[PDB]
């Protein structure tokens, strides 16, 4: 269940791109993860029933900084 | 009888940093749909078709060709708006 | 440089698994994206550069479960 979600996160990443990607890709509800922007400094997450609050707090716990740029129905 | 007009679209993901592939492909064994995805027009890909790797070429209208094992085929069609 | 992106598609066996597979694949060097695709949502499509598909399959088989390489192609960037 759920409407399809698109979430875009700006991540610090300085050692950590692989770590952010692994953590986001392991998250429940996630169908796709992609690095976006020319500098691959944003993560686009798409899927169903993803909790963006836990995701952001888990990314901050393990990669330092993480901001939501977008949450929308995809 | 294989009829692509009656096949549901594949489950796909277009990577945003590369051009959108113009074709859907559909893989059949004895006319039973096995799976489906996307591929570029006027291009090529290596795909496992049953037991064999097959070099599959696409023309400008998503017609696919290759040495498919007996019983197997991969067919292409243009995605909407392409 | 003018080097084209890779597209690799891997079928993963399912259990309590697709999530561990996605995490392992996403953690690999040069990966731009991972997506669960296919009629049964049991295939991972990976896009990137400098990915060794044989080493990736070995890694998956070792740390997660059975996996079969289904596609290796290049992105048409022309
Ligand atoms: Cl292709």
Numbering used by the authors:
A (entry chain A): 185 to 199, 202 to 260
B (entry chain C): 32 to 113
C (entry chain B): 184 to 199, 202 to 263
Task: Give verbatim excerpts from the published study on this entry.
Intracellular nucleotide binding, leucine-rich repeat (NLR) receptors are key components of plant innate immunity pathways. The integrated HMA domain in the sensor NLR Pik-1 directly binds the effector AVR-Pik. The Pikp NLR allele only responds to the effector variant AVR-PikD, but the Pikm allele responds to AVR-PikD, AVR-PikE, and AVR-PikA.
We found that one double mutation in two adjacent amino-acid residues contained within interface 3, Asn261Lys and Lys262Glu (henceforth PikpNK-KE), induced cell death in response to AVR-PikE and AVR-PikA. To this end, we determined the crystal structures of Pikp-HMANK-KE bound to AVR-PikD, and to AVR-PikE. Each complex was crystallized and X-ray diffraction data were collected at the Diamond Light Source (Oxford, UK) to 1.6 Å and 1.85 Å resolution, respectively. The overall architecture of these complexes is the same as that observed for all Pik-HMA/AVR-Pik effector structures. A key interaction at interface 3, one of the previously defined Pik-HMA–AVR-Pik interfaces, involves a lysine residue (Lys262 in Pikp and Pikm) that forms intimate contacts within a pocket on the effector surface. In the PikpNK-KE mutant, the position of this key lysine is shifted one residue to the N-terminus compared to that in the wild-type, so that it occupies the same position in the PikpNK-KE sequence as in the Pikm sequence. In the crystal structures of Pikp-HMANK-KE in complex with either AVR-PikD or AVR-PikE, we see that this region of the HMA adopts a Pikm-like conformation, with no looping-out of the preceding structure.
